[PDB]
């Protein structure tokens, strides 16, 4: 059987909000290691990799490795009904066609039971090697979100380039051109100034802002976002899920 009890239910709510607009249907893979997911958008242009480690759950029971195919929008609609302070439990019968989400208030004065139909999904999973990226940008998630929103109002493509002079986000459109250059502050003296730019080799790649903007739906999960770049690879945009996992977005470049 499957029974996963997550005390911080709001994390699951945020995770679903982060992926439902990128992928319509996807499989959630359960194993003794954790609750995960890997799926590409319909265009195979972007990929999302989610992992909630077993250690983050208060109760974790997964008798056998299993996969639950789900309509992400429907799962999100149900999770939207859980309170931000609710303890959420995912229950499933290995030989079942439905999944149950229990929503429990801390005092227990309220217990909700939401049940959803499971669907068969034959999704394509890709093998992703642990590479050492040439440039890595760790910056405030809110700032990354603003940059993508701002640039997308100007053009459709953003050129991200990292050199010893910092990281530049550039776009051009009908109304003109726009670029934003970020540099590490003298010190990390406040959250807004928490920008770390690691440059091993310079990198410059072009990406679709429409996708970048979808990735920013994970902003509420962390105050920080990490962008990893390499000349021969898709960009990786990562948001940590508390201290129990992550959501990693991969986006193929425009060349």
């Amino acid at each position: 059987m499957l029974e996963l009890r997550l005390v911080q239910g709001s994390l699951l709510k945020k995770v679903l909000e982060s992926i439902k607009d990128l992928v319509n249907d996807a499989n959630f893979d359960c194993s003794s290691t954790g609750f995960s997911l890997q799926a590409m958008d319909s265009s195979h242009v972007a990929l999302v990799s989610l992992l909630l480690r077993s250690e983050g759950f208060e109760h974790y029971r997964c008798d056998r490795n299993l996969s639950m195919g789900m309509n992400l929008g429907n799962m999100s609609k149900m999770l939207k009904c859980a309170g931000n302070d609710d303890i959420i439990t995912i229950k499933a019968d290995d030989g079942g066609d439905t999944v149950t989400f229990m929503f429990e208030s801390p005092t227990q004065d309220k217990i909700a039971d939401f049940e959803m139909k499971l669907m068969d999904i034959d999704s394509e999973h890709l093998g992703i090697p642990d590479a050492e990226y040439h440039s890595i940008v760790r910056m405030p998630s809110n700032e990354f979100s603003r940059i993508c929103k701002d640039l997308s109002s100007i053009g459709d493509t953003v050129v991200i380039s990292v050199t010893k002079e910092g990281v530049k986000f550039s776009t051009a459109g009908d109304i003109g051109t726009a670029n934003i250059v970020l540099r590490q502050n003298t010190t990390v003296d406040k959250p807004e100034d928490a920008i770390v730019i690691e440059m091993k080799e310079p990198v410059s790649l072009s990406f679709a802002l429409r996708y970048m903007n979808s990735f920013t739906k994970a902003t509420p999960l962390s105050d920080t976002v990490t962008i990893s770049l390499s000349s021969e690879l898709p960009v990786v945009v990562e948001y940590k899920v508390a201290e129990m996992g992550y959501i990693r977005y991969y986006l193929a470049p425009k060349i």
């Binding site: 265009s43 195979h44 890709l126 898709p234 193929a252 470049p253 425009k254």
Partner: peptide
């Protein structure tokens, strides 16, 4: 030209 994730990593 927009490349694909599959142009980098295979299934």
């Amino acid at each position: 030209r927009q490349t694909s994730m599959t142009d980098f990593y295979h299934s």
